[PDB]
Amino acid sequence: KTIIINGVQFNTDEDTTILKFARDNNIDISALCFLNNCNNDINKCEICTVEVEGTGLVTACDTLIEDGMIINTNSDAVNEKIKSRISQLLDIHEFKCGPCNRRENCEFLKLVIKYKARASKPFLPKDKTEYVDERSKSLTVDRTKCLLCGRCVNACGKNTETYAMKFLNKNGKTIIGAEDEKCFDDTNCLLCGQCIIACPVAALSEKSHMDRVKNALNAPEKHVIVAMAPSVRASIGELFNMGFGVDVTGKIYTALRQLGFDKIFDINFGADMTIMEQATELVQRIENNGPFPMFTSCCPGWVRQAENYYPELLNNLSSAKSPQQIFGTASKTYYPSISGLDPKNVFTVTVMPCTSKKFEADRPQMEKDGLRDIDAVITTRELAKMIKDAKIPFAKLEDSEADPAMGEYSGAGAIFGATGGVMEAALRSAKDFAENAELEDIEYKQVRGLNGIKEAEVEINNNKYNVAVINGASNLFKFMKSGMINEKQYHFIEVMACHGGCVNGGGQPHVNPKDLEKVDIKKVRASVLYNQDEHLSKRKSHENTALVKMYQNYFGKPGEGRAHEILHFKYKKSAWSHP
Numbered sequence: 110k111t112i113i114i115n116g117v118q119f120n121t122d123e124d125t126t127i128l129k130f131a132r133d134n135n136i137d138i139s140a141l142c143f144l145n146n147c148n149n150d151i152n153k154c155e156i157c158t159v160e161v162e163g164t165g166l167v168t169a170c171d172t173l174i175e176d177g178m179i180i181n182t183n184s185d186a187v188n189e190k191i192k193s194r195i196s197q198l199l200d201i202h203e204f205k206c207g208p209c210n211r212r213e214n215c216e217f218l219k220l221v222i223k224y225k226a227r228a229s230k231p232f233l234p235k236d237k238t239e240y241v242d243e244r245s246k247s248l249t250v251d252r253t254k255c256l257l258c259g260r261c262v263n264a265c266g267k268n269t270e271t272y273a274m275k276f277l278n279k280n281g282k283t284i285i286g287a288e289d290e291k292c293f294d295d296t297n298c299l300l301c302g303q304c305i306i307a308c309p310v311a312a313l314s315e316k317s318h319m320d321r322v323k324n325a326l327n328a329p330e331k332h333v334i335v336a337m338a339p340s341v342r343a344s345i346g347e348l349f350n351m352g353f354g355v356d357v358t359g360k361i362y363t364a365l366r367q368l369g370f371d372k373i374f375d376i377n378f379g380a381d382m383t384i385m386e387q388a389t390e391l392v393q394r395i396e397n398n399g400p401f402p403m404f405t406s407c408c409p410g411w412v413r414q415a416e417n418y419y420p421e422l423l424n425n426l427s428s429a430k431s432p433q434q435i436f437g438t439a440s441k442t443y444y445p446s447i448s449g450l451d452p453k454n455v456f457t458v459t460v461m462p463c464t465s466k467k468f469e470a471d472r473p474q475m476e477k478d479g480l481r482d483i484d485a486v487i488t489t490r491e492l493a494k495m496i497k498d499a500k501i502p503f504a505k506l507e508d509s510e511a512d513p514a515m516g517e518y519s520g521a522g523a524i525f526g527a528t529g530g531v532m533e534a535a536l537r538s539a540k541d542f543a544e545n546a547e548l549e550d551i552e553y554k555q556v557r558g559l560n561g562i563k564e565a566e567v568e569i570n571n572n573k574y575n576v577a578v579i580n581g582a583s584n585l586f587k588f589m590k591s592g593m594i595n596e597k598q599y600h601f602i603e604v605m606a607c608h609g610g611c612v613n614g615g616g617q618p619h620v621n622p623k624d625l626e627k628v629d630i631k632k633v634r635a636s637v638l639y640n641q642d643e644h645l646s647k648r649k650s651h652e653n654t655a656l657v658k659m660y661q662n663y664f665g666k667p668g669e670g671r672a673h674e675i676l677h678f679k680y681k682k683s684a685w686s687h688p
């Protein structure tokens with residue numbers, strides 16, 4: 110093929126779109142609705158408009174290159190068309206970037222600036238109440254910002270295959286939302302927030318908990334605990350122009366103290382707790398044979414997927430609470446026993462890469478004696494904004510350490526945020542528990558990686574067992590619908606709703622398509638976690654000295670006694686009722 114782009118001749122045999130061929134040859138072409146190798150097929154934004162000689166204006170994002178094509182990407186006719194489309198989008202967009210939560214990284218704003226587009230009539234709604242949906246515990250919608258680009262809809266389909274995010278006809282007008290415009294929580298939605306990640310603007314956001322936190326911080330009698338998820342220390346640095354894959358663990362501990370938090374702990378400690386219970390439970394299920402398989406229960410997105418699509422598997426879920434919930438349980442019980450604080454005055458806050466974590470924390474039964482396990486959950490984005498609002502020079506901060514009591518963690522807990530992380534961490538303890546030894550080789554590389562469905566055969570106590578790691582909610586459906594579950598007897602299965610693991614969560618920092626092309630965001634973030642595991646002395650959850658002291662002095666033996674009573678949570682399919 111011979112391609113002419115802006116007077117430059119190209120000789121290629123590649124079969125691809127004009128947009129991507131231009132991107133591969135450093136030729137600038139704008140784009141909006143195009144994401145994850147798909148565009149808005151029904152109402153194309155036409156921001157990727159280029160001029161093909163002999164044909165006219167075409168959309169470069171979905172037009173294959175052909176031999177003899179003469180393309181102009183920066184002609185006048187092209188730029189006026191693109192400027193016209195952006196202007197029309199501004200006519201339905203509340204253009205007030207000042208208080209907006211996408212101010213520092215909004216794809217639309219940089220398109221408005223690039224083409225210097227102005228609205229024919231400034232969209233200024235008198236009352237955003239009808240445009241805004243804040244009924245969910247995880248998601249919020251602001252349709253004053255929605256461009257109707259369909260990226261959220263496509264993302265939902267690709268990532269979860271639930272199609273919970275739909276195009277809707279709201280009284281003659283086209284909008285996006287849940288089925289029948291219901292609250293997302295009341296539908297088959299997983300609350301994974303992958304639709305947020307795909308949104309170029311502030312139309313989709315997480316359900317804010319920042320008022321919960323700030324009100325608790327300012328309350329004199331409240332002792333506010335904060336504990337961040339594995340993925341946060343590998344991600345939040347992106348929002349401070351520090352690049353990708355930068356371990357900023359120490360900076361976060363310091364920033365949290367300057368924010369006024371009363372105690373700095375870590376969810377990775379709770380991750381070690383989850384492994385303690387789960388690995389013990391796995392050994393229990395082996396000696397009992399059943400119920401197999403055992404599924405992980407730490408991902409609330411997967412829990413909702415099970416509840417909404419596979420309720421017969423609810424009993425097969427691990428009884429062990431998620432690292433977030435199992436931490437919060439101990440924060441209201443164990444922590445006061447070693448501090449003297451009044452449990453009612455304890456306020457536990459977590460920092461999560463996940464929007465579904467907010468729903469899990471607000472589950473009615475996720476409490477004890479009137480005390481919530483987790484009082485508030487803020488996303489990686491929310492913490493970052495909280496830091497910038499306090500004008501904390503994050504990139505200039507010294508590394509400080511967390512408080513050890515519930516802040517120490519092994520390398521096993523560190524890799525939780527990556528796909529296959531929980532599986533590998535659980536095997537490190539389950540093997541040592543069953544064989545009653547301290548095994549040297551603990552690296553399970555075969556369950557790592559970005560493959561959708563990963564299986565492995567493991568040898569536990571002179572017996573072989575089949576494990577599986579499900580990477581992404583869509584791959585759960587594939588694993589079940591295709592009958593892969595029945596090819597062999599699986600004993601232990603990890604499931605994560607977000608592909609790549611929690612590092613690709615819905616509460617994670619946004620990454621513009623032009624950095625996604627150059628950076629493998631899922632591997633680069635996960636690398637930080639794996640590097641920590643490699644450099645740590647303790648790489649097994651049961652070697653967590655702070656955790657061992659907690660169990661020895663308070664809980665006793667894992668999987669039984671008081672631990673089984675308050676650190677566990679079982680999901681049950683609804684009792685029979687009719688209708």
Ligand code: 402
Pocket residue numbers: 337338339340341376377379380407408409431432433434461462463466525526527531611612614
């Ligand atoms: N609870 C919990 Fe988890 C832990 O530890 C986080 O905290 Fe995850 C992360 N990062 C999230 O959100 S949840 C699913 N298990 C894998 S990692």
Ligand code: SF4
Pocket residue numbers: 202203204205206207209210211212213215216217218254310311312
């Ligand atoms: S979504 Fe983007 S363009 Fe719209 S107001 Fe917010 S920052 Fe500005």
Ligand code: SF4
Pocket residue numbers: 254255256257258259260261262285304307308309310312313
């Ligand atoms: S909510 Fe966001 S991703 Fe979905 S159509 Fe609107 S602007 Fe596009």
Ligand code: SF4
Pocket residue numbers: 264265266268269271272273274293297298299300301302303304305
């Ligand atoms: S939270 Fe997940 S399941 Fe729900 S609409 Fe968004 S992408 Fe779909």
Ligand code: SF4
Pocket residue numbers: 300301407408409410411462463464465466605606607610611612613614615616
């Ligand atoms: S994989 Fe992690 S971030 Fe994604 S829904 Fe599950 S718990 Fe939340």
Ligand code: FES
Pocket residue numbers: 139140141142143148149153154155156157158168169170171
């Ligand atoms: S980016 Fe090509 S039509 Fe929208």
Ligand SMILES: [Mg+2]
Pocket residue numbers: 325326327328329331369
């Ligand atoms: Mg205070």
